Amino acid sequence: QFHREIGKLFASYSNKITANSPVQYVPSPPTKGKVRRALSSALMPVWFKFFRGPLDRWNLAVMAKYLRDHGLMYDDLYSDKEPVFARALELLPPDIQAARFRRLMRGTYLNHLRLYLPVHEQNYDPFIPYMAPYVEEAKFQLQEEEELLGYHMWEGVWYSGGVTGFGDKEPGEHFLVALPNLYGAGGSPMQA
Amino acid sequence: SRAVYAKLWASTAQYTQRRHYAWYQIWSRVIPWSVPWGIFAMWMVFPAMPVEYRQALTFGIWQKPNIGTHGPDP
Amino acid sequence: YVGKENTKGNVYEGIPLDQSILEPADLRDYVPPHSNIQYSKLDNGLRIASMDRGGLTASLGLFVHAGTRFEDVTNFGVTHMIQNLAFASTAHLSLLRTVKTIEVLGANAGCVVGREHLVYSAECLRSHMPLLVPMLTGNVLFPRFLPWELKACKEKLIMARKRLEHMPDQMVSELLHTTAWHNNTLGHKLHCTERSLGHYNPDVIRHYMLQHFSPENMVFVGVNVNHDELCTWLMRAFVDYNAIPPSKRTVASPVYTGGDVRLETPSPHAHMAIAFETPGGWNGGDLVAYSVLQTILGGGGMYTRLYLNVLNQNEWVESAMAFNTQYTDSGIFGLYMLADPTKSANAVKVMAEQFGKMGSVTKEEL
Amino acid sequence: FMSLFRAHLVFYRCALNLNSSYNFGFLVAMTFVLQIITGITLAFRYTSEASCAFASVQHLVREVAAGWEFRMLHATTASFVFLCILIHMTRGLYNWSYSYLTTAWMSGLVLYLLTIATAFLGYVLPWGQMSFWGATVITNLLSPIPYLVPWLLGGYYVSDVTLKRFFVLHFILPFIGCIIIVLHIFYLHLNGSSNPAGIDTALKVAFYPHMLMTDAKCLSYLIGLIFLQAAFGLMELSHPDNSIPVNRFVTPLHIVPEWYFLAYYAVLKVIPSKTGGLLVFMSSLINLGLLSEIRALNTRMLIRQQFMTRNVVSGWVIIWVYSMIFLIIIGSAIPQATYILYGRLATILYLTTGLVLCLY
Amino acid sequence: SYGNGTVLMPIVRRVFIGALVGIYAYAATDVVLIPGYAQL
Amino acid sequence: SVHSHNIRPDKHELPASEVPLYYNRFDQADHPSLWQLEEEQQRKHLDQEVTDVSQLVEPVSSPHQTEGWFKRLRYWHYKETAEPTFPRTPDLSKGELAAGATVTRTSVWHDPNEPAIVSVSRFAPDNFRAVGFAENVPNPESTNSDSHPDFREYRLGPGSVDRRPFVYFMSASYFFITASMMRSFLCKWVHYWWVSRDMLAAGTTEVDLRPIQEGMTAVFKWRGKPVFVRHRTAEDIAKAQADDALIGTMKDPQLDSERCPRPQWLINIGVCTHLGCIPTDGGNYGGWFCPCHGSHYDTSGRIRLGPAPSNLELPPTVFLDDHTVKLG
């Protein structure tokens, strides 16, 4: 019985992994092996003074000036085409949300005109992390759904309801389900 | 109690292993489709092979069709 | 289930169901359990009661003394909100994980509001009790009340009454209550009105809970569990945390107004009900008198007073009934009837006669 | 189909700060339509015979009214097809458009492959020396598999049969192009275009009045330039050696493909193993394909701003462009050790800077 | 991810990464190592 | 819908108040409920037995209605030619129909003895029914006639075999014939792109070598490809043999004596082994140089430098005489 035997293989491996579980926080093992840690530690005094130092300083200068020209913050660079950030934006309070909207409007207009702001308008720190408390919550909420619902490749009915059947939940987002109607006036999913 | 909450938290620690198991299952269901399509591949590419290889791969069953032309010359 | 360790499969394959498969090892000599109630108390105040009958499934329940008769003009609707938020996110579990785990254990669980109590309960095999005690106590020990859960749960506050529009009997119950005690205590509605959706913010919920959900206002009850394990796993739940501190609350006596009310709708009967107050309620000494009289008259048999003297002597009544509802400190007792809508004036006369002669009884019926 | 026309090309709402760099798609489409018109009217008088194809093309120029104009418009608009495509690609490498326009980017790559094939098939039809020997080379390049090359040729060597089927294929492929263009635009408008600033913004504005006029302006410029080059011949875009009849036993003494093929040619000059040659093309195209799912290759959350303005570090796309131009330069020259040496330097740069795009 | 319809681009991702590893292995064998063993 | 009506005045077709094409006799009720009664008091023609076609009841309406040139169909009922301002008054004494226009623009509904509101109530279209209506209008009970067979005589009952095997065998048979035919079609279509039966690539040739001079290269045509024949000088031979000491270094090692069975005669296929171009005279090793990607060959044909993977290929050849060679 092939399937039950390979079951046995999988089960024993999982039990090994289970038996080694800690019961409390334990610091992660380093990201680099001891050889590379040694080599980096040896070459630090030259590499950081001549190359890495100036690279990491020039980078922040470039970023800051570009953000100040337009009056953006750093966390204004993230999109809502990203599910986690979409959730984070859903969880925002009114004031932060309104200010973000305003800054994005102004940045669009300024990049259209290609005119610098006066230097007295540029006196602020652009790298404040104002989205962090919300991104962490979004990550939690979207991780639990994977754990509790996404753990298997579920089976569906194909090309029915406007969805392909392989997992989508919004109609006509893929080519083989384009053009839902041939007559009439159509409609929108949001008005069902 | 801490103990019970710990057990409940840990219930899903092995997500990646369960996903590998899912890979295994779906590929086991899928992979036999290779036999129909393999036969058809071979069906199409058989008459491209050398006559000797056609004779060999069919254990000598296949031979040149006899249509009454191109016979030997005394 | 990442693979499975046992490969033997269905070891009873092909054995008919009228042919036993038990080995002599699995026989026992029966010893009953003992089934008188066992009573205990935690140090923080919680009272625990348990019984065992040797069934395989257990019943677990947490009882809180927080009904709707304890609300006021600033609070109306808060108890419904709390019930509609049961098994939502708490300190150490999320809403999704909680409900999904309860589903996968195989259990059925829920919460119920009344006019004097709030109840949480669950049920499945008795071997799962240690996993269920947390999830029941969580709701009263440390809920979070995140705004985006309150907002998403709102429509269930309105559907609760939207369904009452096709349950005439229950509808009449609510009319009786709000007419008997007008605008006070037991009179309050069991649901959120439109005026009740304003104060749907976490601070009001939390401030209400701080006044009622202390341990000495609670009871935990278990059936088909071993009492020392129940005590152990309940003690292990409150040991790390500070519970809501006690409060010396006071309760006002209901004021009975009585009165009259009508509500028309296309139903093909005239539904009518008349009632009088029970002084003292469940704490009055005459709790048995009313409950005997209800069976003399006819509860919700065919040799009862109403069945003989109303239903068998009039062609135009579909049903006549006596009802009796009691609370800690007041109640009501009365008669209910469905009649042909053209003869309501006769329905009133019949009811008046019946009330007329409840005072007197004969020993056969008694 | 009018309601769709209005939804997508009149009421569709864009971002205010879309400058000219977002107009080149429309332009390549227009060069497609135009190339199709001139194609069809050239087909009415072309002869698909190895004995007489060449003289067939000469007859149009010499003895037909306005004969010269259609041939030269068709010849010159090809260069603009490729120039506009390369600008259009580089814009989206610069912006990291493929971050969220995944399937659009894939469709783009397929369209570019279609265009390469179409152009090369066209390049054989006038049937001069360069045509014959180019066909010989590219057919020998795809030799690894037995019998596939005599089959695709039709014959043991490049022949009239080869001309006939190349002509039919060159007829057909552009229209398949058009179908894939519709698919392209479906994926595009499913998402919505990016800004030059790479932010999300509500300061949108409708298409018909503002952006339609910019499209029209650039269209005027392009029609202008095509006619300038076509009528006066300012640049030597095409080498003279296709003007000589074919000889099957003598090669031309100096060889230069059309400019849009020179970089590829450079590779074939400098890598020793022929299979290594072919694998470089395959690998680079696979690398470009791989950019479609760059969000998955890392767990840091991605942004579209590459902060290339004022930056002393420049960016990998700019190094890619300069490496490619250097390869064109070396493509053009004779085979000599020093050219090959700097060739190999440039080739290593071209490969590495493509690999490295995934490493954010 | 759960509740999403993109199912064929992940496969292409893995195939492409595979294929590049392949190609680079073979190229190292063909263009460098085999000649090197004539110079070793 | 996309379809118009055609209500218009017409001079070939008089209005229906003037000339109705249907049989214009209708009964009238005071209230349509009364039509119930007649359905349970009349006789019906379909309740009674007939056996021959000649016994079928005869239509009430006349055959002689519609006339004109080239009009096949001679009988119609309804038309939409428009009514005038003042319609023809129905004569209710003859049971003529009163409906729509003829109620609105006529005095027909007037009665001396009755209120007007009561009188108009009898002229809704439900209050009229033709003569013969209750007697002739069918009302089926089923789609099936008891004189025809339904599933009851064809159902496979208790005791029957299972037929799934047969059904699926039937369809599998259809499909395997289908697939054989499809494969044949694709095979023919593929084969049709293959080389034609006139080409055949067969042949052999011979070459006379008297006219050749030392240091010269002659070129000839063979099986579609060029072939070089060279009369090497002593120094060409020496150049070739000096590099035999460096055979270690070559991409395709071979010694000169194999390539020149007669040392002074060199023969090769004139084609670059890289991608098929034809090498030119010269290069760094006094042999040949390919312009397409820069491969070099020595004075014996061997690949010394560049991307080409092998030496120039030796053709199958024989020296027929001291001064004549055979190719193929």
Ligand SMILES: CCCCCCCCCCCCCCCCCC(=O)OC[C@H](COP(=O)([O-])OCC(O)COP(=O)([O-])OC[C@@H](COC(=O)CCCCCCCCCCCCCCCCC)OC(=O)CCCCCCCCCCCCCCCCC)OC(=O)CCCCCCCCCCCCCCCCC
């Ligand atoms: C026009 C179409 C016609 C209409 C009908 C539709 C036709 C499609 C039928 C074929 C599908 C059969 C397989 C069924 C799978 C069911 C699984 C399931 O429960 O569903 C949920 C599951 C998704 O749920 P989920 O797991 O929650 O989603 C998370 C993600 O999947 C991410 O998950 P992850 O990241 O955790 O990774 C999971 C991944 C882990 O595994 C890997 O990633 C492995 C990667 C290794 C690299 C090797 C390549 C792997 C792909 C194999 C391709 C071979 C097939 C072709 C064979 C050709 C034979 C001639 O798992 C798999 O790859 C397992 C599934 C792989 C199956 C793919 C091939 C199935 C085809 C079998 C029939 C072949 C006959 C074709 C004949 C010729 C014509 C095409 O479904 C899938 O994953 C779908 C897989 C199948 C692909 C989609 C079908 C295509 C539809 C579009 C049509 C395109 C046609 C274009 C032509 C146009 C002509 C003009």
Ligand SMILES: CCCCCCCCCCCCCCCCCC(=O)OC[C@H](COP(=O)([O-])OCC(O)COP(=O)([O-])OC[C@@H](COC(=O)CCCCCCCCCCCCCCCCC)OC(=O)CCCCCCCCCCCCCCCCC)OC(=O)CCCCCCCCCCCCCCCCC
């Ligand atoms: C009988 C009672 C009646 C029953 C009725 C029931 C109902 C069902 C019917 C049944 C009755 C018979 C009906 C006749 C059916 C058959 C005839 C038939 O079908 O002919 C078709 C026929 C095809 O003719 P054909 O193609 O010329 O046939 C040539 C032959 O195929 C010759 O071609 P070939 O020789 O070149 O074929 C090659 C073949 C050659 O085959 C053979 O030679 C095989 C030999 C078979 C031997 C048999 C064995 C079984 C018997 C043994 C006996 C057992 C004894 C025990 C029992 C008895 C004692 C107890 O080899 C292969 O296929 C490949 C080999 C296998 C591949 C798999 C790889 C295996 C590797 C082996 C590994 C082992 C190691 C080997 C290595 C060596 C070193 C160790 O149709 C046509 O000619 C075309 C018709 C035109 C229609 C066109 C279709 C439509 C196209 C229009 C489309 C355009 C419109 C757009 C689309 C429209 C879409 C809707």
Ligand SMILES: CCCCCCCCCCCCCCCCCC(=O)OC[C@H](COP(=O)([O-])OCC(O)COP(=O)([O-])OC[C@@H](COC(=O)CCCCCCCCCCCCCCCCC)OC(=O)CCCCCCCCCCCCCCCCC)OC(=O)CCCCCCCCCCCCCCCCC
């Ligand atoms: C020399 C050295 C260098 C060599 C070159 C090296 C190159 C290396 C780099 C490679 C670059 C990328 C190549 C393509 C990768 C595609 C990966 C993929 O699957 O992406 C999934 C991805 C979506 O995956 P997802 O997000 O998971 O969504 C899940 C959905 O369920 C999925 O459903 P959905 O509805 O959302 O998606 C649309 C669906 C369904 O799409 C449709 O139904 C569209 C149908 C349009 C048909 C129009 C006629 C096209 C005729 C073929 C033209 C080929 C030109 C090739 C250029 C060279 C010419 C010499 O299509 C697909 O899912 C894709 C199917 C596979 C496409 C394969 C395309 C390339 C090969 C095609 C030709 C094969 C050779 C034989 C025929 C040759 C004839 C000349 O789809 C795309 O991004 C596709 C974009 C459109 C591009 C393809 C357009 C043509 C479609 C042809 C379909 C097959 C029939 C062919 C004709 C047969 C009869 C004659």
Ligand SMILES: CCCCCCCCCCCCCCCCCC(=O)OC[C@H](COP(=O)([O-])OCC(O)COP(=O)([O-])OC[C@@H](COC(=O)CCCCCCCCCCCCCCCCC)OC(=O)CCCCCCCCCCCCCCCCC)OC(=O)CCCCCCCCCCCCCCCCC
């Ligand atoms: C330089 C030389 C000059 C030479 C000059 C020579 C000039 C000769 C001119 C001859 C003109 C003949 C026609 C006179 C018409 C008079 C009309 C009249 O007085 O109307 C008064 C009056 C008009 O008042 P009304 O209010 O219109 O009432 C009449 C109704 O509307 C009627 O409607 P209804 O409902 O009462 O009747 C039913 C209705 C509806 O009936 C039906 O629908 C029934 C249809 C049944 C068909 C069954 C067919 C089955 C067999 C098919 C076999 C397969 C065949 C196909 C395949 C074959 C292979 C190819 O019947 C019809 O529609 C009857 C149609 C008769 C058509 C006759 C056509 C004759 C053509 C003669 C040749 C003319 C020149 C040809 C062209 C030349 C080049 C431009 O009509 C009547 O009283 C009725 C009179 C009907 C007379 C019909 C029979 C005429 C016989 C004429 C004999 C001529 C012999 C010539 C010999 C020449 C030797 C040289």
Ligand SMILES: CCCCCCCCCCCCCCCCCC(=O)OC[C@H](COP(=O)([O-])OCC[N+](C)(C)C)OC(=O)CCCCCCCCCCCCCCCCC
């Ligand atoms: C995904 C698969 C897509 C498949 C699309 C392919 C469609 C087009 C197929 C063209 C095949 C041409 C073969 C070239 C050789 C010359 C053919 C020829 O006529 O030779 C003469 C021969 C006859 O020879 P002859 O008699 O002329 O003389 C020469 C003698 N021999 C052949 C021995 C050298 O003709 C044929 O037999 C016709 C060729 C049939 C071959 C058909 C091959 C079909 C390929 C499809 C297989 C796909 C499998 C899946 C692969 C996918 C992998 C990821």
Ligand SMILES: CCCCCCCCCCCCCCCCCC(=O)OC[C@H](COP(=O)([O-])OCC[N+](C)(C)C)OC(=O)CCCCCCCCCCCCCCCCC
């Ligand atoms: C996607 C492109 C496909 C091209 C097809 C060509 C493939 C190669 C040649 C044929 C190979 C054999 C057929 C494949 C095997 C059968 C498929 C299968 O698994 O069966 C599923 C099923 C088989 O059903 P079944 O009921 O017989 O059995 C299945 C049930 N079990 C497993 C329990 C036995 O097929 C169908 O139900 C198909 C329904 C249609 C049947 C009639 C089709 C006839 C043609 C109609 C008109 C055609 C014109 C339209 C085309 C447009 C162009 C002109």
Ligand code: HEM
């Ligand atoms: C994107 C679309 C197209 C491109 C990029 C393209 C490209 C080319 C190129 C580069 C040439 C070479 C001309 C020369 O060297 O002088 C050519 C020639 C030709 N093309 Fe196309 N072409 C396209 C569409 C078409 C179409 C649709 C047709 C016909 C339906 C067509 C028919 C021809 C013909 C007949 C020639 C021969 C010109 C001559 O012999 O002088 N082309 N094409």
Ligand code: HEM
């Ligand atoms: C015939 C070839 C092509 C046509 C007709 C075409 C057409 C278009 C059009 C009209 C647009 C929208 C307007 C514009 O951006 O100008 C567009 C956008 C786009 N195209 Fe193309 N394109 C072609 C080739 C390509 C190629 C080769 C690629 C990638 C290799 C590509 C990738 C993209 C991307 C990513 C966008 C959107 C960028 C963004 O929104 O930021 N396209 N295309």
Ligand SMILES: O=C1C(O)=C([C@H]2CC[C@H](c3ccc(Cl)cc3)CC2)C(=O)c2ccccc21
């Ligand atoms: O030697 C060559 C040569 O190498 C190519 C090459 C240029 C690049 C081409 C090419 C390479 C890759 C792609 Cl994806 C498309 C086209 C193939 C032909 C020519 O075009 C040519 C034309 C005429 C005579 C000789 C030659």
Ligand code: FES
């Ligand atoms: S074809 Fe001769 S070197 Fe490339």
